């Protein structure tokens, strides 16, 4: 039960596998563009308005 993704999550750059699916994330912040090591991210379901 996570409603909003904190920017401090994206402050780390070493994230590789983000199992964020099936949540109540209102939206994914654009700060995910900082992440480079991210090779897979689970975004199915949720309350994701747009990618």
């Amino acid at each position: 039960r996570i409603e909003a993704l904190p920017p401090e999550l994206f402050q780390c750059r070493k994230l590789r596998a983000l199992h964020l699916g099936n949540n109540v994330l209102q939206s994914l912040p654009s700060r995910v563009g900082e992440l480079t090591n991210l090779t897979q991210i689970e975004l199915r379901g949720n309350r994701l308005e747009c990618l």
Binding site: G21, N22, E42, R44, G45
Partner: protein, 51 residues
């Protein structure tokens, strides 16, 4: 005809992020399907006269 390894091959995901077994136009339901215990979703398509 349906070894558990064939069911491992058949294993996939669905629209709700569950472990799906797509069974298509089968004569029935094998007990080998129920031998799999990691299964999260069952897909039975036009498999009639099944108990």
């Amino acid at each position: 005809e349906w070894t558990p390894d064939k069911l491992r091959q058949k294993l996939q995901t669905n629209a709700h992020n569950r472990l799906e077994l797509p069974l298509i136009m089968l004569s029935g339901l094998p007990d080998t399907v129920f031998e799999i215990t990691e299964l999260q979703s069952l897909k039975l398509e036009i498999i009639k006269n099944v108990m």
